[PDB]
Amino acid sequence: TYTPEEYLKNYALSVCIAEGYSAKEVKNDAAAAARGYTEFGDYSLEAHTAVRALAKEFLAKPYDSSGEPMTMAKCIDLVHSQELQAIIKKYQ
Amino acid sequence: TYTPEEYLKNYALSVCIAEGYSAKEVKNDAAAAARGYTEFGDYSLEAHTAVRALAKEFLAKPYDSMSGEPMTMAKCIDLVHSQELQAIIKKYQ
């Protein structure tokens, strides 16, 4: 199993990747993963929407890359961030 | 921001996402991220190639899905939390 916190972090990564790339292949796949972490998770739908909002905040940050958008790095930083931890502790 | 084990975990997820999806957009971006996470001050070249082998094994597993999507994202998440990845980290410590 994952813990509730780990599920909400998996959800964070999954929605971040689904939001941050345009390829339908990936949006659809990561979206289905995010739905699964929400259904097996314990956090409220509100906690989930605040995580999604935070993911968009991270994706909106301009990273210096290589010429790549560095989405992958933004989503990894999101999962590791003090900001996501604050959301977890607001709701826990 | 990251210990060397957290970097190797970031590498693992990046290479898994680069390997796991067809789309060049995501492939190029995730591969570029994996290069950034590649360091050899605590994890050898061989530690990395074992991480990549393990990612490809995770991607090879069939996952059930009510959506009919392959669940690549879930496979890669499972990789990063796997005992097999921990064993790599311990071995090459």
Residue numbers in the entry:
A (entry chain A): 27 to 91, 93 to 119
B (entry chain B): 27 to 119
Give passages from the manuscript:
To prevent self-harm, these bacteria also produce highly specific immunity proteins that neutralize these antagonistic effectors. In S. marcescens, the resistance-associated proteins Rap1a and Rap2a neutralize Ssp1 and Ssp2, respectively.
Rap2a, like Rap1a, is predicted to be localized in the periplasm and could only be produced in soluble recombinant form using the E. coli Rosetta-gami (DE3) strain. The structure was determined at 1.9 Å resolution with four molecules, arranged as two dimers, in the asymmetric unit. Together, α1, α2, the α2–α3 loop and α4 form the dimer interface, giving rise to a twofold NCS axis, and a combination of hydrogen-bonding, salt-bridge and van der Waals interactions serve to stabilize the association.
